[PDB]
């Protein structure tokens, strides 16, 4: 295992001297911002405190070096500068973490990347516009490829598409006033909205997304009310009862995304379970009793 570390510095051509720092970089301010509070006071990022304590102790060391202070003060100051940079990069790694006000450990630069709240899992592996969510309600009359979304959800979801059509049919003079019409819900938009969502598939999602059938594509149907109407046969895939569940809606924009929803993700093209091959969209509760 020692060779594993030594051979890495030998072949690569980078010096191990990089493990000892002569200068520490400062992350740009917008990534550690200081915001003003509605009470007149200020709230800042913890990284500013860590950088500030490194600056305070490094400037004090420069004074001791200039003053020729006893080696006991200079050495005991250099130790503190070591612990400050250790807290800036990974507070809490060695010993007890630098606590802020209220015995709260300050976040370090490495804390921006760790765990579920880190940069990778929170802002890279998962992130979206053109989406919504509401309560789901059973719709027996719907076909397997159909779903019912509220009119008020579809208007906001298809807002730019509706603005485009409001200005084509000369319901609105310019695209600017076409936006004010959708925001004010002028009665012309409900006739225009029906033309827009025509054969434009949408995606329905219920968390937790355990398997790939946790997200399926449907043909939207403008329905009154404020609840999403879901087909009774896709309830098994979503593991979705109707005791207060909510589902998310995502609108594919590009031609490729709509084609992926129309062909790959359509609920009618996914009747069988990919895990076992046995059907899922089949009579399950009232339907099996009726038959």
């Amino acid at each position: 295992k020692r060779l594993k570390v030594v051979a890495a510095f030998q072949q690569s051509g980078n010096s191990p001297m990089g493990m000892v720092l002569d200068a520490v970089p400062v992350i740009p301010p917008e990534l550690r911002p200081m915001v003003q509070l509605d009470g007149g006071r200020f709230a800042t990022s913890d990284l500013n405190d860590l950088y500030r304590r490194v600056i305070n102790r490094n400037n004090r060391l420069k004074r001791l070096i200039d003053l020729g202070a006893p080696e006991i003060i200079v050495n005991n100051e250099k130790r503190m500068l070591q612990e400050s940079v250790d807290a800036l990069f990974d507070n809490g790694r060695r010993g007890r973490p630098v606590t802020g006000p209220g015995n709260r450990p300050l976040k370090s630069l490495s804390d921006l990347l760790k765990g579920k709240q880190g940069r990778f899992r929170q802002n890279l592996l998962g992130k979206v516009d053109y989406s919504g969510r509401s309560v789901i309600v059973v719709g027996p009359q719907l076909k397997l490829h159909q779903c019912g979304l509220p009119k008020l959800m579809a208007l906001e979801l298809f807002k730019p598409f509706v603005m485009k059509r409001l200005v084509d049919l000369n319901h609105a003079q310019n695209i600017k006033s076409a936006k004010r019409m959708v925001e004010r819900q002028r009665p012309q938009v409900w006739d225009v909205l029906e033309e827009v969502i025509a054969e434009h598939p949408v995606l329905l999602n219920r968390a937790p997304t355990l398997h790939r059938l946790g997200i399926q594509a449907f043909e939207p149907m403008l329905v009154e009310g404020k609840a999403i109407q879901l087909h009774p046969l896709v309830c098994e895939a979503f593991n979705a009862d109707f005791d207060g569940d909510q589902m998310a809606v995502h609108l594919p924009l590009s031609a490729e995304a709509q084609a992926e929803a129309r062909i790959l993700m359509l609920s009618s093209n996914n009747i069988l379970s990919p895990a076992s091959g046995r059907p899922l969209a089949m009579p399950r509760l009232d339907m099996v009793t009726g038959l």
Binding site: N14, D22, V24, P25, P28, M34, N48, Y51, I55, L81
Partner: protein, 96 residues
């Protein structure tokens, strides 16, 4: 800025690399002024180092218009571009 580039290389940052990135040293420990909201010079938010708070607005207030695009102000040392640079310009602290 196309989206096809093959490799993503990572390595140890030389102390000389830290200086090659840095647009200036953060000397003072102060942050901003609590009346004018203007950041103090050489502080953790110094506009001479990181960039202007507002677009095309310098610290001392001599250059506030777009016509002076790219001028390094002589009295406060702040460049005049958009505040987008305050998301990418690195600083550094030179250790004793």
């Amino acid at each position: 800025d196309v989206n096809f580039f093959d490799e993503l290389r990572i390595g140890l940052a030389t102390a000389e690399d830290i200086r090659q990135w840095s647009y200036g040293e953060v000397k003072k420990p102060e942050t901003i002024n609590y009346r004018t909201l203007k950041p103090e010079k050489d502080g953790l938010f110094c506009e001479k180092i990181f960039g202007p708070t507002r677009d095309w607005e310098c610290y001392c207030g001599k250059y506030k218009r777009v016509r002076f695009k790219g001028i390094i102000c002589e009295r406060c040392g702040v460049e005049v571009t958009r505040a987008k640079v305050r998301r990418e310009r690195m600083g550094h602290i030179e250790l004793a």
